[PDB]
C-alpha cells in the first residue's frame, strides 16, 4: 500500500540545541536524545541562528513516514504482523481508515483497553491466573479489540502471553481476536531495519533485551502496532494523549446502525502502574471511558481503590502521602512536594467522576472473572451517559445475556433511579431466545413484557484549557481559596504587561460595567483576583477583558403537550420543553443567549444568528419575568484574573394556543443563516453544557417540573 507517506506524518527536529546532559553512555545529544551525528541533515548546518532556546512547538516539523510494513520476528514466531509509524497529531480519522481497509480489520464490538505497569511488575500467581481466564473469556466472544501498549515488559507482555496461549489452544485455532499495540517510537531498541522510505514487508526485528540500556523492546505476541513519534528519543508517555482520542473516536463516532449513531462499548482495566497510568486513567475517564481498577495489583490500583468511595473533599494532600508511602516504598524518596500536589488533583478528579469508575474487589466481592466488573462498568456508564439516549443501554443488556450473567441483568431491571418502559426490553429478549437461555426469558416475561464533600468551582479548575495546548497548575479542592497559603503556586499566563492602570474596578469603568454581583472583589497589582478561589491559570485567556464578563443567557419554556392540548403529565410529574440552539460544529446544544453587546439589550445570539425583524417586540416582552440566578458560573474558560457572570431570566408560556405569544415566536424563530435550531425535553440527561444544565436544574424547580 502506498497510501502512507501520503496521508501519515512523522516528526523530526530541525536544529540541535546542545542541551547540557550526557545521556548514559554518550557525550551530549541535542536536547531530544538523538546525537548530532544522526540528527537529520541540515541541523548541523548553520541555518542562521534561531536563538539558544528549545521550544517543541516552534522547530519540529512533520514529514512523510518511512516506518511501516510487516514485521517478522527472527525465530520465536514465524508470522506476519502489521505496523505503522504515526506522528503525535495525526487526526483520529485517517488512522481508523488505515485500520479498516489497509490492514483488513473489521468493525469491532468491544474496545478493551489494558493499562498498567512496565519494567517493574510481578503478578501474584493467583492474580495472573484470574486475569488470564477473565481476559480470555471476554475476548473469546464478540469482536473485542485489545488496545494495549506494545513492549516486552510487565502487563503489556503478560497480556500477549494470554493471547498467545488462547491462539495456540482453540477450536477455531489460529488467531480470532485482534490485539492492537500502541507505543512510543522513541523508546524502541532496534529501530533500525524498521525504517524504509518506500516499504519492505519482511521488516525483520531481532529481539535482544540484554543491552537495551534504557529503551524498551517491542512485544512479540501483539497483532498490530501503531508507533507514535514526537521527535524525541528515550522519552516515554507520548502515546497517552493520542490513544484516548482514537479510542473515543472508535467507540462513539464510527457506527451508523439505526440511522442516528451507536456507541460501541469500551472499558479500561488497570493492573498496577505508575506515573504513566494515572495520566491515562484521567484522560480516559475525562473522555467518558469507563475504568475498572483491579484491587490488590499495587501502586496505582490500591491507591485509587482505597479512596474510590470517600468524598472528594477529604482526599487531601496528607491523605495521599499516607497511602503513597506504603505502596510506593522504594520510590517514595523520588516523590517531591510539587509532584504529590499533582498526584492528588488527578486522583480527586478521577474519584469525583464516580459514574465512570468501578473497583474489582478481590476476596468477598465479584468472586469471578473480570467480566462481571466489565459488565457492571458498562451498564453503569450507559445509564449515566448524556448524548446517546435510552436506546443505548438496551444493548449492553444483550451483551450481558451473551455473557450468561443473569444477576447483572436483574439488577438493572429493579433500579429505582432508572425509568425504563416495559416495551424497551425487546432487543435483549430477542437475543435471549436466540441463545436458548430460558432464565432470561423467564425473568423478562415476568416483568410485563407481554408478547401480543466540598462544593468548589470544578470546571474552572479543569485541565486542558479549551482551544489551547496549555495545562493548568494542579490545585486540589483543599487549597482553592485565596486565603489558604499555597507556596508551590506558579501557574502559567496564557491569554489569547503591567501598565494596565486607569481601570476603575468594582465600578462602571466607562462602557464596560466591571461590577461583580458577589460584592466588591480585590485587585492584585494591575489584575483582579478570581472569586470563589483559584483556577490554576492566570491572565484572561479566551475572554473579553479582565474582571467579570457579563452575559444575559435567557431560558424559554412551554408545557409538554402531546396530542390533545391537555398538559401531558408524565409518569412522575410535569415535564416542560426548553428551546435550545446548536453550534455548527459542536457536540452539545447551547442556551439561546450570549454576550450583552453595548446598548443591545439582547444577548448577541438571540439577536444575531437567530430570528430577525422582531427584536424590539420581544425586547419589550423580555423585560417581564422572574430571575432565577444572577452571577458567576462554573465555566471552564475561567482563570485567576477573569470570569463570566450571567443573568438568567425565565420566560414561560402557559398556553400553546395563546394567540401569537407562542405561535408567532415559533413561526418566526428561524435562523436562515445558522446551522440548526430545536426544542428539547427537560430531563436530567439533556445534552447541554453543564453550566446550562445547572441553570435548568435551578429553574425547573420554580414551576413544579421534574428534572
Ligand atoms: N509504556 C511503557 N513501556 C515500557 N516502559 C515504560 C513505559 N512507560 C514508562 N516506561 C519505563 O519504565 C519505568 C516506568 O515503569 P512504571 O512506573 O510501571 O510505568 P507507568 O508510569 O505505569 O507507565 C506504564 C505505561 O504502560 C501502559 O499502561 C501505558 O502506556 C502507561 O503509560 C521507567 O523506567 C520508564
Ligand atoms: N458553557 C460552556 N461550557 C463549556 N464549554 C463552553 C461553554 N460555552 C462555550 N464553550 C466552549 O467554547 C468553545 C466555543 O467558542 P466560540 O465558538 O467562540 O463560542 P463562545 O459562545 O463565544 O464561547 C468550544 O470549545 C465550546
Ligand atoms: Zn534535537
- Domain segments of the chain as ranges: 9-266, 551-702
Give 273 Cα–ligand 1 centroid separation in angstroms. Answer: 7
Task: Categorise residue 307: left if φ over 0, alpha if ψ from -120 to 50, beta otherwise.
Answer: alpha
Cell of 359: 473497583
Resolution (A): 3.3
Domain 551-702, what fold? Nucleoside Triphosphate Pyrophosphohydrolase (3.90.79)
The answer to whether the annotation marks 637 as part of a ligand binding site is yes
Cell of 552: 444575559
Number of the ligand 2 atom closest to the C-alpha atom of 605: 21
Number of the ligand 2 atom closest to the C-alpha atom of 692: 1
The CB of 603 under 6 Å from ligand 2? The reply is: no
Question: Is 537 exposed, middle or buried (CB count within 10 Å of its CB: 0-12, 13-18, 19+)?
Answer: buried
Give 55 Cα–ligand 3 centroid separation in angstroms. Answer: 10
The CB of 467 under 6 Å from ligand 2? The reply is: yes
- Beta-carbon contacts of residue 361 (< 8 Å; ≥ 6 apart): 295
Q: How many helices (H) and strands (E) does the chain have?
A: 16, 21
Separation between Cα atoms, residue 22 and residue 292, nearest integer Å: 41
The CB of 549 under 6 Å from ligand 2? The reply is: no
Q: Are 625 and 650 in contact (CB under 8 A)?
A: yes
Q: Are 296 and 123 in contact (CB under 8 A)?
A: no
Edge-to-edge, what's the strand order for the sheet holding 178-184? 204-205, 68-73, 81-87, 224-229, 178-184, 145-148, 111-116, 268-271, 291-294, 357-360
Positive or negative torsion for Cα 363, 367, 370, 374? negative
The closest residue, in CA terms, to atom 18 on ligand 1 is: 117
Separation between Cα atoms, residue 578 and residue 555, nearest integer Å: 7
Q: b/e map of 330-357 (b: 16 or more CB within 10 Å)?
A: eeeeeeeeeebbbbbbbbbbbbbbeebb
Give 59 Cα–ligand 3 centroid separation in angstroms. Answer: 9
The CB of 689 under 6 Å from ligand 2? The reply is: yes
The answer to whether the annotation marks 691 as part of a ligand binding site is yes
Separation between Cα atoms, residue 696 and residue 707, nearest integer Å: 8
- Look up cell 475476548; give the residue: 139
The technique by which this structure was obtained is cryo-EM
Residues enclosing ligand 1, CB less than 6 A? 115-120, 149, 151, 153, 156, 216, 236-237, 239-240, 273-277, 280
- Look up cell 459488565; give the residue: 375
User: CB atoms < 10 A from the CB of 217, how many?
Assistant: 21
- Residue among 540, 541, 588, 636 whose CB has most ligand 2 atoms within 8 A, to mutate: 636
Give 292 Cα–ligand 1 centroid separation in angstroms. Answer: 19
Number of the ligand 1 atom closest to the C-alpha atom of 120: 18
Q: Distance from CA of residue 350 to its chain's centroid? A: 11
* Stretch (H or E) spanning 70: strand 68-73
Q: Are 652 and 559 in contact (CB under 8 A)?
A: no
Give 26 Cα–ligand 3 centroid separation in angstroms. Answer: 15
Cell of 123: 503478578
Ligand nearest to the Cα of 40, by number: 3
The closest residue, in CA terms, to atom 11 on ligand 2 is: 466
Q: Are 237 and 216 in contact (CB under 8 A)?
A: no
Distances (CA, A) of 219 to 78, 87, 140, 169, 297: 14, 20, 21, 20, 22
Q: Are 123 and 153 in contact (CB under 8 A)?
A: no
Mapping DSSP to helix (H, G, I), strand (E, B) and coil, where does residue 125 land? helix
* Stretch (H or E) spanning 161: helix 155-168
Number of the ligand 2 atom closest to the C-alpha atom of 467: 25
Ligand nearest to the Cα of 468, by number: 2
Separation between Cα atoms, residue 214 and residue 118, nearest integer Å: 12
Q: b/e map of 449-464 (b: 16 or more CB within 10 Å)?
A: beeeeeebbebbbbbe
- Residue among 183, 236, 241, 275 whose CB has most ligand 1 atoms within 8 A, to mutate: 236
Strand-pairing partners, residue 649, are 627
Separation between Cα atoms, residue 188 and residue 217, nearest integer Å: 6
Question: Is 593 exposed, middle or buried (CB count within 10 Å of its CB: 0-12, 13-18, 19+)?
Answer: buried
Ligand nearest to the Cα of 216, by number: 1
Give 676 Cα–ligand 2 centroid separation in angstroms. Answer: 16
Distances (CA, A) of 306 to 317, 375, 388, 590, 704: 15, 22, 32, 38, 40
Separation between Cα atoms, residue 659 and residue 565, nearest integer Å: 14
Give 248 Cα–ligand 3 centroid separation in angstroms. Answer: 32
Q: b/e map of 644-661 (b: 16 or more CB within 10 Å)?
A: bbbbbbbbebeeeeeeee
Separation between Cα atoms, residue 451 and residue 429, nearest integer Å: 11
Going by C-alpha positions, the residue among 538, 550, 533 that lies closest to residue 498 is: 538
The answer to whether the annotation marks 120 as part of a ligand binding site is yes
- Beta-carbon contacts of residue 688 (< 8 Å; ≥ 6 apart): 580, 588, 589, 590, 591, 680, 696
Number of the ligand 2 atom closest to the C-alpha atom of 588: 26
Strand-pairing partners, residue 12, are 61
The DSSP secondary-structure symbol of 255 reads B
The closest residue, in CA terms, to atom 14 on ligand 1 is: 118
Instruction: Give one DSSP letter per residue of 406-435, joined into a string.
Output: HHHHHHHHT-TT----GGG-HHHHHHHHHT
Going by C-alpha positions, the residue among 206, 205, 116 that lies closest to residue 153 is: 116
Q: Are 54 and 184 in contact (CB under 8 A)?
A: no
Give 16 Cα–ligand 3 centroid separation in angstroms. Answer: 5
Strand-pairing partners, residue 205, are 73
- Which residues does a chain break follow in the chain (C to N more than 2.5 Å)? 452, 496
How many residues are listed for the chain in this entry?
707
- Residue among 112, 116, 119 whose CB has most ligand 1 atoms within 8 A, to mutate: 119
The closest residue, in CA terms, to atom 24 on ligand 2 is: 466
Give 664 Cα–ligand 1 centroid separation in angstroms. Answer: 62
Going by C-alpha positions, the residue among 119, 149, 391, 109 that lies closest to residue 269 is: 149
Instruction: Give one DSSP letter per residue of 522-563, joined into a string.
Output: -EETTEE--TTS--S--S--SSSSSEEEEE---EEEEE---S
Going by C-alpha positions, the residue among 492, 450, 504 that lies closest to residue 468 is: 492
Q: Are 117 and 277 in contact (CB under 8 A)?
A: yes
Measured torsion, CA atoms of residues 278, 283, 288, 291, in degrees rounded to the nearest 10: -20
- Look up cell 408478547; give the residue: 451
Strand-pairing partners, residue 357, are 291
The closest residue, in CA terms, to atom 35 on ligand 1 is: 236
φ/ψ (deg, to 5) at 545: -150, 165
The DSSP secondary-structure symbol of 472 reads P
Cell of 110: 468491544
- Residue among 147, 186, 222, 276 whose CB has most ligand 1 atoms within 8 A, to mutate: 276
φ/ψ (deg, to 5) at 444: -70, -55
Going by C-alpha positions, the residue among 581, 578, 554 that lies closest to residue 673 is: 581
Going by C-alpha positions, the residue among 485, 652, 637 that lies closest to residue 578 is: 652
Positive or negative torsion for Cα 463, 467, 469, 473? negative
Separation between Cα atoms, residue 680 and residue 209, nearest integer Å: 59
Amino acid at each position: 500500500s502506498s497510501w502512507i507517506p501520503e496521508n501519515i506524518k512523522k516528526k523530526e527536529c530541525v536544529y540541535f540545541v546542545e542541551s547540557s546532559k550526557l545521556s548514559d553512555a554518550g557525550k551530549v545529544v541535542c536536547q531530544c536524545g538523538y546525537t548530532h551525528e544522526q540528527h537529520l541533515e541540515e541541523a548541523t548546518k548553520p541555518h542562521t541562528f534561531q536563538g539558544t532556546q528549545w521550544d517543541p512547538k516552534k522547530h519540529v516539523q512533520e514529514m512523510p513516514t518511512d516506518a511501516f510494513g510487516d514485521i517478522v520476528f527472527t525465530g520465536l514466531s514465524q508470522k506476519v504482523k502489521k505496523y505503522v509509524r504515526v506522528s503525535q497529531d495525526t487526526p483520529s480519522s485517517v488512522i481508523y481508515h488505515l485500520m479498516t481497509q489497509h490492514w483488513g480489520l473489521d468493525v469491532p464490538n468491544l474496545l478493551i483497553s489494558v493499562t498498567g505497569g512496565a519494567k517493574n511488575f510481578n503478578m501474584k500467581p493467583r492474580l495472573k491466573s484470574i486475569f488470564r481466564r477473565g481476559l480470555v473469556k471476554v475476548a473469546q466472544t464478540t469482536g473485542a479489540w485489545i488496545i494495549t501498549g506494545g513492549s516486552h515488559t510487565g502487563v503489556m507482555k503478560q497480556v500477549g502471553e494470554a493471547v498467545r496461549d488462547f491462539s495456540l489452544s482453540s477450536s477455531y485455532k489460529e488467531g480470532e481476536l485482534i490485539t492492537i499495540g500502541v507505543a512510543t517510537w522513541g523508546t524502541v531498541h532496534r529501530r533500525e531495519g524498521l525504517i524504509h522510505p518506500t516499504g519492505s514487508f519482511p521488516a525483520e526485528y531481532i529481539l535482544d533485551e540484554d543491552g537495551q540500556g534504557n529503551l524498551t523492546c517491542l512485544d512479540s505476541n501483539h497483532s498490530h502496532f501503531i508507533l507514535v513519534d514526537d521527535g524525541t528519543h528515550g522519552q516515554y508517555g507520548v502515546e497517552i494523549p493520542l490513544r484516548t482520542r482514537l479510542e473515543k473516536f472508535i467507540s462513539e463516532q464510527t457506527k451508523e446502525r439505526g440511522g442516528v449513531a451507536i456507541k460501541i462499548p469500551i472499558v479500561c482495566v488497570v493492573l498496577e502502574g505508575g506515573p504513566g497510568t494515572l495520566h491515562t486513567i484521567d484522560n480516559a475517564t475525562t473522555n467518558g471511558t469507563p475504568c475498572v481498577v483491579v484491587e490488590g495489583s499495587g501502586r496505582v490500583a490500591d491507591v485509587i481503590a482505597q479512596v474510590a468511595n470517600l468524598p472528594v473533599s477529604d482526599i487531601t494532600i496528607s491523605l495521599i502521602q499516607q497511602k503513597l508511602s506504603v505502596f510506593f516504598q522504594e520510590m517514595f524518596e523520588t516523590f517531591t512536594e510539587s509532584r504529590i500536589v499533582e498526584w492528588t488533583k488527578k486522583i480527586q478528579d478521577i474519584v469525583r467522576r464516580r459514574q465512570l469508575l468501578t473497583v474489582f474487589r478481590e476476596g468477598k466481592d465479584g468472586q469471578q472473572d473480570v467480566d462481571v466488573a466489565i459488565l457492571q462498568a458498562l451498564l453503569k456508564a450507559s445509564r449515566s451517559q448524556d448524548h446517546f439516549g435510552h436506546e443505548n443501554w438496551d444493548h449492553q443488556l444483550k451483551l450481558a445475556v451473551a455473557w450468561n450473567r443473569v444477576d447483572i441483568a436483574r439488577s438493572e431491571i429493579f433500579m429505582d433511579e432508572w425509568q425504563w418502559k416495559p416495551s424497551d426490553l425487546h432487543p435483549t429478549m430477542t437475543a435471549a431466545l436466540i441463545s436458548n437461555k430460558p432464565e432470561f426469558v423467564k425473568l423478562f416475561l415476568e416483568n410485563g413484557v407481554q408478547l401480543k464533600g466540598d462544593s468548589y468551582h470544578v470546571n474552572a479548575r479543569h485541565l486542558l484549557y479549551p482551544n489551547c495546548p496549555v495545562t493548568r497548575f494542579p490545585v486540589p479542592n483543599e487549597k482553592v481559596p485565596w486565603e489558604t497559603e499555597f507556596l508551590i503556586y506558579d501557574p502559567p499566563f496564557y491569554t489569547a504587561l503591567e501598565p494596565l492602570s486607569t481601570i476603575q474596578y468594582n465600578v462602571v469603568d466607562g462602557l464596560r460595567d466591571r461590577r461583580s454581583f458577589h460584592g466588591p472583589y480585590t485587585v492584585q497589582a494591575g489584575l483582579p483576583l478570581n472569586p470563589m478561589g483559584r483556577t490554576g491559570l492566570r491572565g484572561r485567556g479566551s475572554l473579553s477583558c479582565f474582571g467579570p464578563n457579563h452575559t444575559l443567557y435567557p431560558m424559554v419554556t412551554r408545557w409538554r403537550r402531546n396530542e390533545d392540548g391537555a398538559i401531558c403529565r408524565k409518569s412522575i410529574k410535569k415535564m416542560l420543553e426548553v428551546l435550545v440552539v446548536k453550534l455548527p460544529l459542536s457536540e452539545h446544544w447551547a442556551l439561546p443567549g450570549g454576550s450583552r453587546e453595548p446598548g443591545e439589550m439582547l444577548p448577541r445570539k438571540l439577536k444575531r444568528i437567530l430570528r430577525q425583524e422582531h427584536w424590539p417586540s420581544f425586547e419589550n416582552l423580555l423585560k417581564c419575568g422572574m430571575e432565577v440566578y444572577k452571577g458567576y458560573m462554573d465555566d471552564p474558560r475561567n482563570t485567576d484574573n477573569a470570569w463570566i457572570e450571567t443573568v438568567a431570566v425565565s420566560v414561560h408560556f402557559q398556553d400553546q394556543n395563546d394567540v401569537e405569544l407562542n405561535r408567532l415566536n415559533s413561526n418566526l424563530h428561524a435562523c436562515d443563516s445558522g446551522a440548526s435550531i430545536r426544542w428539547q425535553v427537560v430531563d436530567r440527561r439533556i445534552p447541554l453544557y453543564a453550566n446550562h444544565k445547572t441553570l435548568l436544574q435551578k429553574a425547573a424547580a420554580e414551576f413544579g417540573a421534574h428534572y
